[PDB]
Amino acid sequence: LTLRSHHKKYSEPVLVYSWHRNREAFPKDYDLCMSTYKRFGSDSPRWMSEAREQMAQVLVNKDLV
Amino acid sequence: MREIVHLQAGQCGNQIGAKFWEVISDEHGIDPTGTYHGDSDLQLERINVYYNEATGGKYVPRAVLVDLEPGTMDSVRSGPFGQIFRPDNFVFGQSGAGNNWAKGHYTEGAELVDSVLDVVRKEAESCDCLQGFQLTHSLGGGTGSGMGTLLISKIREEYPDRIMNTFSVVPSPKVSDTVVEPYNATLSVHQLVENTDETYCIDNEALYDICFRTLKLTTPTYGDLNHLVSATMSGVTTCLRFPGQLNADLRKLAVNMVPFPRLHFFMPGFAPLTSRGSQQYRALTVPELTQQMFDAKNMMAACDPRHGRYLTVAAVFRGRMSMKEVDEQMLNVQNKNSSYFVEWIPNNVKTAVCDIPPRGLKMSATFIGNSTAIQELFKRISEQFTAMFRRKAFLHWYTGEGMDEMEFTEAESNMNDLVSEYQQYQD
Amino acid sequence: MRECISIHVGQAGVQIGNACWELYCLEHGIQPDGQMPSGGDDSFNTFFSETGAGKHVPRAVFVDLEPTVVDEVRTGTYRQLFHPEQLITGKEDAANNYARGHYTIGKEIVDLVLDRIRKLADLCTGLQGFLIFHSFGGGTGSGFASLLMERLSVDYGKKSKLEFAIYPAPQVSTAVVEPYNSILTTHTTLEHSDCAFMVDNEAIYDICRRNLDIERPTYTNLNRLIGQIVSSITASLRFDGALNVDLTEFQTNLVPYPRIHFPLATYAPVISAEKAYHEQLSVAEITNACFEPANQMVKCDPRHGKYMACCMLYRGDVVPKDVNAAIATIKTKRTIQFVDWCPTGFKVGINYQPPTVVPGGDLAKVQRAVCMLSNTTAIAEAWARLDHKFDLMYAKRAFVHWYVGEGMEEGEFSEAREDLAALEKDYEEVGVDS
Amino acid sequence: MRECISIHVGQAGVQIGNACWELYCLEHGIQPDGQMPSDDSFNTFFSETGAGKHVPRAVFVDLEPTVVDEVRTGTYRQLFHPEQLITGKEDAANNYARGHYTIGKEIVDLVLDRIRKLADLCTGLQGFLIFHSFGGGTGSGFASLLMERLSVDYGKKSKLEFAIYPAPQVSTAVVEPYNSILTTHTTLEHSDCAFMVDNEAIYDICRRNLDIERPTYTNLNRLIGQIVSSITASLRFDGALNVDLTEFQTNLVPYPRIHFPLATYAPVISAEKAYHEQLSVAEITNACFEPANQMVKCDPRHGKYMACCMLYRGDVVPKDVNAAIATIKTKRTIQFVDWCPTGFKVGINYQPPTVVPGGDLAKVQRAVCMLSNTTAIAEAWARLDHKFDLMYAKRAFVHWYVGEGMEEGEFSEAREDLAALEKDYEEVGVDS
Ligand SMILES: Nc1nc2c(ncn2[C@@H]2O[C@H](COP(=O)(O)OP(=O)(O)OP(=O)(O)O)[C@@H](O)[C@H]2O)c(=O)[nH]1
Ligand SMILES: Nc1nc2c(ncn2[C@@H]2O[C@H](COP(=O)(O)OP(=O)(O)OP(=O)(O)O)[C@@H](O)[C@H]2O)c(=O)[nH]1
């Protein structure tokens, strides 16, 4: 006979509501095992502590004379 | 120093623990081999809290992985970081629990509870100044919900002073994958309340909603759910592992989130939750971090806090920031949502700062807090529990284990007694 | 590691074992000789055991009281695959007689089959369970299986015994004295079993005609479908999955009371390649197909009963997200009913590997599949019809002279009739709502 | 060095000497001529000559020529030196009296002289393996005589006794039990161990395990060859735990009047059966305790073990041996007396068993041999005493025996001794 269903897989190029969010979130997509996005950011880390900055300007700053 | 022992029970708990040990190894610049490939020095100064020293610049996490079925262990050893855990820390039984609380907790957990006893005692004597124990499991299972609670019963007698915090997984009423689930939950929550310093109600359905709408994931797997808990897992300890302007530890929140020992139930939250693509828009500031983390849709438990009164709230922020905007921000949201806070504790908010941001991301905040809306969770269990108990259904499985009938009645008495006194503080 | 031993009895047991073991060989990659040419590494350890010569031997016990059906295997394609000690034959059959299968001919080889299964259990380290395949109609598969399960429960009290057995059909019949053995096997399958999978052939006939378009199928078709169902139920043990579910898990989440262990099986999709060419399939698709009464493997309408407990096994490219959407949609139907004392009655398991397709089959290569085990009360009407016809023979004392000459006491007919009436009464008590 | 000299007697002895030495030639590499085509492991069985030949150190004896004449024209005709095969013109024809007092004395000196030269060749002799039958008169009457006259020549040298006891049900003779009684004085007085075996038990084992629905005596002959090869296997080839003949005599005989153990071999399977069954140490050690696998028609479950001896040979690791004996001690229907706490003796050999072409047992990597002393053997003699009294009461067949030259008092004494033998076994069967 036949089966009813609701929704479908579709494809990537074809118009579906939320296709745009699918393809913008495509970076780091893997669909099982593990996660998909890995680290929530991929930019540069930084290791300057507040006390370290507050202490290091005396060593290096505008050495006015 | 201040070390942490990570317990691990069940198919559920083993999969969150593997994901959690993944991120903080990625954070500390730890390769899957077990060596250090990080760059900064702060990445390697307090590695002793989670990683135990080995020869050749190698580190072993201080975890105890337990499951009554060995078939999950082969997936654990074969994962990405599958070899980074010590084989002696793999303790297992030959027969699983079959989703029976009584089978795991008494009949089959008794033989194997001595082996997990030996390793954690060995691991306890390895570190110098242990801060407390952590464990992740499921209340709808038979190993974590069953024998796993028996672990909680034993170690409080051995080590009472140490803080125990359970990131347990509470089943959903709308989505249920176990018929006998309200049983094992009911003989579980009674075991937590007597000995647990703080509890973290995790609901997959709530995490399920977040990946539906907040991250707009077409096909999210189980791993991203474990990633969000792992992110939540990292965001509470991060004030210890790295220096901060205003520091805290587990005790500083474990002392502060409980006004009375019967109240140790909290829902966790994570502030920055957007798409991977969209981070380059969403001009990132401290005020927007506040907006995401007082939204009920952001909450990862199965309860909406609008129907409850927020008893206590504690938030931990990360990365370099100057603090003025924060302290006025929960100063802001305390006045305007005044009806949603209790009146008998003024200034309900605790703050803490860790100077190190999580890897790759810039600013993040972690929300843990007590509120009345958690009482909504337990009463839904009882309405399922008594209906299935009114006909003595699914009972010969429990009766055949040698246990009696009153254990269901006293447990039904206890969390009814809990929700009664919990309700009394709402009004 | 988990091990499930097969205890197939009779002509039905042997044919079903042929289909199921060829399916296992196909999915594991076993050649009929029994060598590996090249989720999980020891995924064959649940069904096959290593030998010194690099050869895998199945954990199967074929027992038949007539040697033709087993000589077919001994001279078939899988002659070298099977231990000739594992195949056990009788010179003369029970001849469709429960008394012959239970008191005269079975006792000659009960010791032999006990020794064989003892060796098969000794070879394994951790035995998960015992899958007993038989039929109530045949005298061998009724009486000898009843005796074996009787002695098996006292030999191994703890080891689970799951029951896959083929019921007499409501309308068609391959026999006339089938209902007698049907009554007399009910006590044994009530007392010494943990769960049952009663199958009638008419529903499978209808499914294969209406869905797979086979107007003229054969018995190997139904046997392939049963093997597919058993592969689905053993998939969580054989391969890895997000939610691995053992036998004990669904035993716990399908049985409320010791006298209720009779759920219904259901496998979906069952379609041909000419249809799967075009029909898109999804979790909602397969879960809606699993609730069609014309799709049910028994000849009963669950709409005339109430669903008590459901165990679902999703397999393949399945995602819990769509699983839960399917669950919510299922919950939001009036026609689907549940008892007052089971507000949450779903037991979900998930496996990675999609089902494999044999050559010469009918099922198209499908990426997702689902198996459902539904304990419900609409099954009682089948035993009610059985009681009607059994009394409709028993009142005039027909066919009992053969049994009496074999040597049992005529009271047990009335006792078993009373037992089945009481069981129907108990199912009515469960169906009672407060 | 180590050496074994065989004194096989009777139509059994000639036929089992041929079969056993067929196996001995194949394992070392002796040609039927006697040539090595390619260290001195063969010295226990073979010996060098002046032409570089290897000659077996065996003495085949029979009192009828036609049995040994088939050997003299056989395949190995040029391997056996013709004097070592000894014949006689007339035989006893199933009578103990004729083979012990009339015809035996004719050939006593020549067989005794022959055994002197074979022993003269050897330097350090380890023991005498003796094979005969209780049924045949010449294998009983004469074999009894040499045992008395070998003991006076060598009082200390070991005399192992492999024998064919009559089967409980089937028989090749009616006058057989008489020979069985009066020979049991000899195997008591002038023997050091016993290995009685009835052909009925092997007839059972061969047809049920090796699938030969019609075996012959050769099939029975080969299996006994496998037993005697493994009991000597420690001497011939090196191993982790070498076990001499003097070694297992000590841990099998708690009392000198009790020297009647039971041998057991495992596995005994066909290649059709060997392909599908995995063979490990556990799977072969349990078969050595099954009553269906015994070569004597008696059930040890009706009795208790005094002393068990283990002969491990093949791909065998010391780890699984201790695990196998651990499980065996953990079985209740296997019983032991109160005064034997530890009743094992393990030996380990490295060379795996060989197959003869036209044989029955498939080539295997490991096996086990058992030598267990149990009191369940006692009921076998009681049946024999039962059968003896049903004919001694009627004085049947006795007129044959007295006419040969011996008195009528001896049958009473021989019957009495076996009752005393049976009585002593119950004393050990009693637990304090
Ligand atoms: N589904 C299915 N049913 C079968 C098959 N073979 C036999 N049956 C059923 O088994 C019933 C009769 O029992 P058999 O298996 O033929 O014979 P038996 O079990 O050895 O018992 P005896 O007749 O006494 O020898 C028939 O009514 C069939 O419905 C089969 O291959 N598939
Ligand atoms: N197992 C086995 N038994 C044998 C064999 N040859 C003879 N026998 C046994 O010997 C018994 C009869 O005695 P024989 O050995 O034939 O003759 P004998 O020992 O020379 O004594 P006499 O007949 O007086 O000459 C039979 O009952 C057989 O059981 C053999 O090759 N194998």
Ligand SMILES: Nc1nc2c(ncn2[C@@H]2O[C@H](COP(=O)(O)OP(=O)(O)O)[C@@H](O)[C@H]2O)c(=O)[nH]1
């Ligand atoms: N969030 C999350 N939940 C999981 C995961 N694995 C299993 N679960 C949940 O755990 C429950 C089953 O737990 P179970 O395996 O029976 O626990 P056990 O008896 O201790 O082994 C199910 O309801 C799942 O929803 C996971 O990786 N993440």
Ligand SMILES: [Mg+2]
């Ligand atoms: Mg039949």
Ligand SMILES: [Mg+2]
């Ligand atoms: Mg003779």
